[PDB]
Amino acid sequence: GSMLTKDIEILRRENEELTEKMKKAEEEYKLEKEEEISNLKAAFEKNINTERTLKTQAVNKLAEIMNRK
């Protein structure tokens, strides 16, 4: 067979495999940006569900105390 025919086929395949190294490259970059935040939030929450609880308790106690003053 002619070499030209083959070189062309091999090129349509690389450019093709390259397109698969994109769609499954982006699908990849997803967990990166998705994980780094799927815990960057859940981390900022625990930290606020803590301060918020201490805030509420102090407030309620103040109310209890003043209603008794």
Binding site: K55, V59, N60, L62, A63, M66, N67
Partner: peptide, 9 residues
């Protein structure tokens, strides 16, 4: 808003 509880006092 967080102090709403105390106002009625």
């Amino acid at each position: 808003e967080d102090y709403d509880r105390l106002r009625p006092l």
